[PDB]
């Protein structure tokens, strides 16, 4: 999702941790970025209890149709935006809500 403020593109895990740290390690601070290790997937970086958690977002296919998921298909999303919007109100597998957008 190119036009989203929480989307930082192809940056590293180290760099996302630095940005979050620089922003106060505030609980609920988050960003999404591309995954190098999982080429057409993403990583949600989320700050909770002064640590930075990293959640893998994998593409997959149902009846040919593409969806994203962090929990091996238990909870499925059309695109990154829906995943992010859902988790601003619902924890799901996350330890907390996505509360603050890390500045890109």
């Amino acid at each position: 999702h190119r036009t989203q403020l929480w989307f930082h593109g192809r940056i590293s895990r180290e760099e996302s941790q630095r940005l979050i740290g620089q922003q106060g390690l505030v609980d609920g601070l988050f960003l999404v970025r591309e995954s190098q290790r999982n080429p057409q997937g993403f990583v949600l970086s989320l700050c909770h209890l002064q640590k930075v958690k990293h959640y893998l977002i994998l593409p997959s296919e149902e009846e040919g149709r593409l969806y994203f998921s962090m929990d091996d298909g238990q909870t499925r999303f059309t695109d990154l935006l829906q995943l992010v919007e859902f988790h601003q109100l619902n924890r799901g597998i996350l330890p907390c809500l996505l509360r603050h957008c890390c500045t890109r």
């Binding site: 958690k53 990293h54 959640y55 893998l56 929990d71 597998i93």
Partner: peptide
């Protein structure tokens, strides 16, 4: 759940 990530 996935090596090197915090999912579940």
């Amino acid at each position: 759940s996935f090596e090197g990530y915090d999912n579940s």
